[PDB]
Design a protein around this nucleic acid. Structure first.
Ligand SMILES: Nc1ncnc2c1ncn2[C@@H]1O[C@H](COP(=O)(O)OP(=O)(O)NP(=O)(O)O)[C@@H](O)[C@H]1O
Ligand SMILES: Nc1ncnc2c1ncn2[C@@H]1O[C@H](COP(=O)(O)OP(=O)(O)NP(=O)(O)O)[C@@H](O)[C@H]1O
Ligand SMILES: Nc1ncnc2c1ncn2[C@@H]1O[C@H](COP(=O)(O)OP(=O)(O)NP(=O)(O)O)[C@@H](O)[C@H]1O
Ligand SMILES: [Mg+2]
Lengths: 915, 403, 409
DNA sequence: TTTTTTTTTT
């Protein structure tokens, strides 16, 4: 709380400003680094260390006394070296709250016994000398605890002699009884053993967040060599007129009344955390916040590691905070915690997978202790606004309000520059606020941060009211007329500037200035990059591990896009799940084909690279083609799935410049399908290999420039007629799969045909719009994805399915002539190796095509290149003359006769976990 | 404190206090009859999740019904309010019912509320009014008549509910019309809101006339001077523009545009809105909270074969299509144009030699459906090849939202 | 105080960190030199970044200039407290009042906008944009800038004044032959090209992709005999060079006939300022056009656009499975073409009895080309090969002795 | 403003 008092005094007290100007301009010639032997005076408010000579020491004492004359607050400590004045510090615990008066008779008796101890325990200079004593008392007793000081500037002693005197005094029964009779209930431990060497407080100064001691009276002791028995003590008078700063200084050499008695002579680690706190207010706020965490966060390894990672990610130099936090449990820290802290900090400097920051720490502190967190953070807000109010005499401006707003809500809004060069605001949607369906726990995009607009006029006005209350309280306090006039002027200016926060232009300016503070570099770049995180209607779904986890709590994953479907665990007994499973059983009769189709459609969840396959559907109509594909698109939503125009796959592309928003619809999509085609349709093979391959594609979007993105969509196509594929490329055909429909739905099915079923309009008219069936199907998809990951390591290429492979082979054979030649005539016979040259095989192909298919004039080079385009690469080795030779196969050259050489029981979705 | 939870809500929510004052004006039938009581409970639950004490207090207006299963009734109605996604009413209906059943008491209560809000704002800041203060008061005055939401273009769009009597286009009664600029709000800021400032001036002058300490009189005189200086700014164009720009954040309603005109069973007509959810169809001539914007200029009336125009149309239909079964099927197919949702994958091809009434009936259907629900389509949209890759196609865009 | 005074002081304070120039659109564009320890994108250190709005300057106006303002206030108060004649004291009091009136304007949005608008004239540097990335011997990398103007190549991790804006995210490391990724890439590359002379010639040609200036422009007809799986190495070269320095091109550019007198062409606008260009995956066995070769293989300014003209700097590679058809006898075309045929495939279920079929590994394509370590290892390999070529044959690929390439051509 | 549309190309 001392910050407010310090700023106010530096504002309305001109003498404090003069003292600071001296310390920063004229005494600046005597700076000393911490730990230097020359240091004699330290200002721990700013942490600086100084070394001032006698004349400059007198000047400094004069200026503090002038500041002390006006009642200012400060904290200056003189560094007691090897030789200085003796010091005695007492902390009194009392039977009751009654203050021990420390009467001058009692003080005289105590001083007499102290002199007896010092004279019998140390040598004294010859002749007659006078020793000055002073006593500063605490302002109040708290819970029966009190304190007072016995400082002796005149008795110049060494540290060892002072420590011996302190120990003897503590163990002396006479002094203990003297203190006890006055009211001290703990005379044996009241005196601080370290009082010999602790720095001495200059009079008028007070400890940080502590009230200053009050000087009660002074005493002078006279002793003589010729009279070592009698100990006269005289009470010092006129104590109000002396420069008490100089006269109470233990190390002082040029005191007005204090004369030196030349009698007998004989860690930065803690400072680093304070340095970090002073040079960074956020570090101080975090240190205040971290104390609210329960003990589990520094005892259990996972929570402690999370805290360490968050601190390291917040700032690279926040290590002292982590070290201090780990020291909450000395046992765990000492038993290997140091090495663990080293390793964790190194990993945080290395790793990039645990992305947590101070937002999580703030959330944990708020959850565990809401009221204390609120009080601390509101005190922080008031403190931050206080410097801006005081320094500029109440004339608040846009930048001041933007800074306070960032301090108030910095962990909820992020602004980044998009491709257009315009600043775009993002907000993290917490529960219990107006929001669209399904956008909870995600970063939503806002054209204009209206929530911040409301927040400026609704919540910041409370801090304004607190500032006004503070000013009114200071006005009511009795002060100097000049101080009252200054506070009146400040109140008038602040009231003039108080209503600006309700103005439209002022708020626009504040938010425009706040865009610079909330800016986070590369935020859009990392948005929605992680393919294992999928946004859902009730949180975010994480498929990083098996089983998948639903996150219904705070998180910092940069996720923006989402689907409205709420995720629920897979349950076969749900009526909608049973209905959907029966529908799947009805749509696809073959068990292996159904399993392969469901495994393939499960990969639509994953938005990353995959095995580069495309599915072709064949069906005459009314066989569920549109239902299943559209259900997948509906459950995946618009952001992750979209219908695609077939011309995008069957035509020559537009110039790179030409936007092609239809092509830009493939960005970020895990699934895409074309529901419509023509009778006569030739799919373009260059488009096909361009869109099914795992790689980069480029196109422009409306109001944007050139851009490249990875192609990560699951592609499905359906039609009433077979597509035309005008190529024999083995690389093209391995990318394709084909399936043909069997079951047909009709209003009046023939009972003698197992492939005719009664249609139910509800499937497409109602059972695709009910959210319940949608989310049940999403659960089924998640379950099938998990099953694929746990049984085939996610590789769809290794799924066993005779029906799909047989139908794809038939489909290819119906168009690829050379494939027919190889399949029907070129048998792979190890018993009939008969090494052939490529020209011989080309002649065989020409003969077969002429005799069996059609007469045609062939080209040897083209035919050779085309059998280089087939499965013959398994056998086409290199001859010694480097000529292509076929090996290990027999050719049926011309009209040669060929020569040698499961059903589910109860749960089809759980079929064969053992293969 | 559980019995005092109602007062705990009162001290924290001014809107709850205003509703409690309003709810006392409802006639006894709204807590005696089950339908009206259920409607009130649903509206209270939809307005706020924590408004349960208000519903419990209101249900106690008839203790005999409350004791005889009323508590369990209130509990399952509260649960169904979260369960039911079709019963969409809010505090707007409660305010309308209270205004209908007691105009003077409702008027005085709500005017007292306006005066209290404005007086608090004036006293808190010594009469220096700003845009957000008048925006807050205007939202209090018309929080249930204007709604603003961000369209697809990133531009805030104002919507207004049209009531009888006010100037309007023909057929837009009982619907949310779209306002480029909130004209009525601009008029209301200067015309109606100015009378509350007159009440503030009367209050200040009355306190000035009251005998007080000289310091109090000086403070009130300074406050009066500041308020008179700030009073004329409500007639300034720039000040009103800023006030309305700030009011867009208070009138904001998330997902309003998303749900606009999505229900296919609700059809906007010239004299209200037509609901075809259940047979017979019902016409809504009264206040409602259905988010309906598009409409047709046709005024709906119940079917009557004795109407001369109905007789003429039936005779014309008989003349055009001779066969009875064909006529019934054609009328059934054309009737599906009323419904704007998913329907059977059918198309009708009609062939004729010419001058045989084909375009008469086909165009009459589109004339009676209006432009927002029906449209003529280009033949090239059906007999020509699709445009190459991506090109804008406004002809195909005409298909959105049309039956 | 007014806008120009604060603009002058801001230029005096940060004149060596921000530069503004007028682009082709007539808009003043701010550029900032990115020093270590400040918020930035990954890899933009030690380079000039384009700023639509000088955010850092906006912060610096209100965060650091206020300290100079405070120093001025301290000076004024010190003179005010000094014993002076009443006239001087009144003058200083008036000056302090006026300064305090003007002190708070530096936090105003309109005032800061005006200050920055006036500062756009002081920070202006003529022809700054025209000199950006013009030096071909300087290559921007993730951890600084790589200089290939001297042997060996040198990486800069300190202050410099080279006008570099574009860069690749690949971080440069010295070529370590014992690095695991380096060993893997070297073994795979040895597997790809069986002939040693052909391997050295191919790597020396491919290493010229780093240099962005003029070069011999010899097209390489890499016929992937055996359907090797050509995507790996060729896409890896473009991946390590990045989009700013490498370009993907369509085979339709070489087989399509020359355009009409007004029809726009989409290929040359994506071809300018690049160090590498590649054509891949032929399946139609397309016949190439001689005018399309002349449109690019000869050194000079290309003219077709979507009109606009510029120089040719891309290293070109043509990948084929099935032979192209060159329908000309022109010795001027044949002297600029080079032909090579591969003999190795890496595919699924190879025969163990021959070395020319090897087991495929899909994780190569799925992760390793996306693995930063593999990419930077390959970049180090490319840098080493460029250094070896420069130090052995003076960088001319014409004089590289390779019997295999000559015989196959 | 500024872009997209239109224009231009298929
Ligand atoms: N599991 C099912 N059980 C019963 N009826 C079903 C089922 N699945 C789909 N339907 C019916 O199938 C009818 C047509 O299916 P739909 O998927 O729209 O046709 P389609 O096969 O795509 N034919 P097409 O539109 O010509 O492409 C729907 O109207 C439903 O009545
Ligand atoms: N019920 C009716 N009784 C008598 N005349 C009628 C009737 N319905 C329509 N007509 C008239 O018949 C004429 C033909 O109507 P219209 O609908 O324009 O023709 P159409 O069948 O669409 N012919 P077309 O477009 O020329 O091939 C018009 O003059 C109508 O007014
Ligand atoms: N050196 C190698 N060792 C082992 N496997 C390899 C090697 N190089 C490539 N492969 C694998 O061989 C396959 C060929 O991949 P890819 O380079 O995409 O082939 P491609 O025929 O050029 N493809 P595309 O142009 O897309 O049709 C992949 O499974 C690679 O992982
Ligand atoms: Mg269909």
């Amino acid at each position: 709380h001392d910050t407010i008092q310090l700023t106010a005094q530096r504002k309305y007290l001109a003498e404090v400003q003069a003292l600071e100007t001296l310390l920063a301009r004229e005494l600046s010639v005597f700076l000393t680094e911490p730990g230097s032997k020359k240091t004699n005076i330290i200002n721990r408010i700013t942490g600086k260390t100084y070394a001032l000579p006698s004349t400059e020491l007198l000047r400094f004492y004069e200026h503090l006394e002038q500041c002390r004359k006006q009642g200012a607050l400060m904290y200056f400590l003189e560094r007691q070296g090897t030789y200085s004045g003796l010091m005695l510090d007492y902390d009194l615990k009392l039977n009751t709250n009654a203050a021990p008066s420390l009467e001058s008779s009692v003080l005289s008796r105590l001083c007499h016994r102290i002199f007896v101890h010092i004279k019998n325990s140390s040598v004294l200079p010859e002749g007659s000398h006078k020793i000055h004593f002073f006593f500063t008392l605490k302002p109040e007793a708290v819970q029966g605890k009190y304190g007072f000081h016995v400082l002796i500037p005149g008795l110049k002693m060494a540290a060892s002699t002072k420590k011996s005197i302190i120990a003897s005094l503590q163990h002396d029964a006479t002094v203990q009884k003297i203190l006890h009779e006055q009211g001290v209930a703990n005379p044996e431990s009241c005196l601080d053993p370290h009082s010999a060497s602790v720095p001495s407080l200059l009079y008028g100064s007070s400890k940080l967040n502590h009230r200053p001691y009050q000087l009660k009276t002074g005493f002078e002791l006279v002793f003589d060599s010729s009279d070592p028995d009698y100990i006269p003590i005289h009470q010092i008078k006129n104590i109000e007129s002396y420069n008490l700063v100089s006269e109470l200084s233990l190390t002082n050499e040029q005191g007005s009344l204090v004369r030196p008695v030349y009698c007998a002579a004989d860690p930065a680690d803690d400072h680093s955390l304070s340095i970090l706190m002073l040079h960074d207010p956020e570090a101080r706020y975090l240190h205040k916040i971290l104390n609210l965490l329960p003990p589990e966060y520094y005892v259990e390894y996972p929570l402690w590691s999370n805290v360490v990672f968050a601190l390291a990610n917040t700032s690279a130099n926040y290590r002292p905070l982590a070290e201090w936090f780990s020291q909450k449990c000395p046992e765990k820290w000492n038993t290997g915690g140091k090495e663990k802290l080293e390793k964790l900090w190194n990993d945080a400097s290395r790793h990039t997978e645990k992305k947590i920051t101070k937002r999580s720490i703030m959330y944990w502190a708020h959850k565990h202790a809401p009221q204390q967190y609120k009080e601390i953070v509101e005190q922080g807000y008031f403190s931050i606004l206080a410097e801006y109010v005081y320094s500029y005499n109440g004339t608040l401006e846009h930048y001041m309000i933007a800074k306070v707003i960032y301090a108030m809500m910095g962990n909820k809004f992020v602004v980044d520059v998009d491709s257009n060069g315009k600043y775009v605001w993002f907000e993290f949607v917490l529960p219990g606020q107006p929001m669209n369906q399904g956008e909870i726990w995600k970063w939503r995009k806002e054209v204009n941060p209206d929530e911040l607009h409301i927040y400026i006029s609704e919540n910041f006005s409370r801090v304004m009211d607190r500032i006004t209350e503070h000013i009114k309280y200071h006005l009511s306090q009795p002060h100097e007329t000049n101080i009252l006039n200054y506070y009146k002027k400040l109140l008038k200016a602040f009231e003039r500037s108080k209503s600006k926060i309700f103005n439209d232009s002022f708020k626009k300016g504040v938010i425009r200035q706040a865009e610079f503070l909330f800016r986070q570099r590369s935020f859009i770049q990392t948005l929605d990059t992680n393919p294992y995180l999928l946004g859902v209607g009730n949180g975010v779904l994480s498929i990083e591990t098996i089983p998948a986890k639903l996150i219904n709590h705070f998180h910092e994953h940069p996720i923006h896009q989402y689907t409205h479907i709420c995720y629920e665990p897979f349950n076969p007994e749900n009526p909608w799940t049973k209905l959907l499973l029966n529908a799947l059983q009805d749509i696809i009769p073959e068990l292996d084909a159904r399993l392969w189709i469901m495994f393939y459609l499960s990969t639509a969840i994953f938005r990353g690279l995959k095995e580069a396959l495309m599915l072709l559907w064949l069906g005459g109509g009314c066989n569920g083609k549109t239902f299943l594909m559209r259900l997948v698109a509906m459950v995946l939503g618009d952001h992750y799935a979209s219908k695609l125009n077939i011309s995008l796959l069957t035509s020559y592309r537009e110039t790179a410049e030409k936007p092609n928003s239809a092509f830009m619809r493939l960005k970020g999509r895990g699934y895409g399908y074309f529901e419509e085609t023509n009778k006569s349709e030739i799919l373009n093979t260059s488009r096909l290999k361009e869109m099914v391959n795992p790689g980069d594609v480029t196109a422009r979007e409306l109001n944007q420039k050139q851009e490249s993105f990875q192609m990560t969509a699951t592609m499905v196509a359906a039609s009433n007629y077979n597509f035309i594929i005008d190529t024999t490329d083995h690389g093209t055909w391995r990318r394709l799969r084909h399936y043909r429909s069997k079951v047909k739905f009709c209003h009046n099915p023939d009972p003698n045909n197992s492939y005719e079923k009664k249609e139910d309009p509800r499937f497409i008219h109602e059972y695709i719009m009910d959210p319940n069936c949608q989310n049940a199907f999403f659960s089924i998809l998640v379950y099938f994805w998990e099953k694929l990951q746990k049984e085939y390591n996610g590789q769809i290429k290794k799924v066993f399915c005779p029906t799909i492979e047989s139908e794809t082979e038939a489909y290819r054979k119906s168009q690829d002539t050379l494939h027919r030649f190889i399949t029907e005539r070129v048998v792979e016979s190890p018993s009939a190796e008969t090494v052939y040259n490529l020209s011989e095989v080309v002649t065989a192909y020409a003969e077969w095509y002429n005799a069996n298919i059609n007469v045609k004039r062939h080209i040897a080079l083209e035919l050779s290149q085309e059998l280089e385009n087939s499965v013959l690469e398994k056998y086409l080795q290199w001859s010694p003359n480097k000529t292509r030779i076929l090996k290990g196969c027999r050719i049926l050259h011309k009209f040669e006769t060929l020569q040698p050489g499961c059903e589910p029981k109860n749960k089809w979705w759980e079929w064969s976990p053992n293969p």
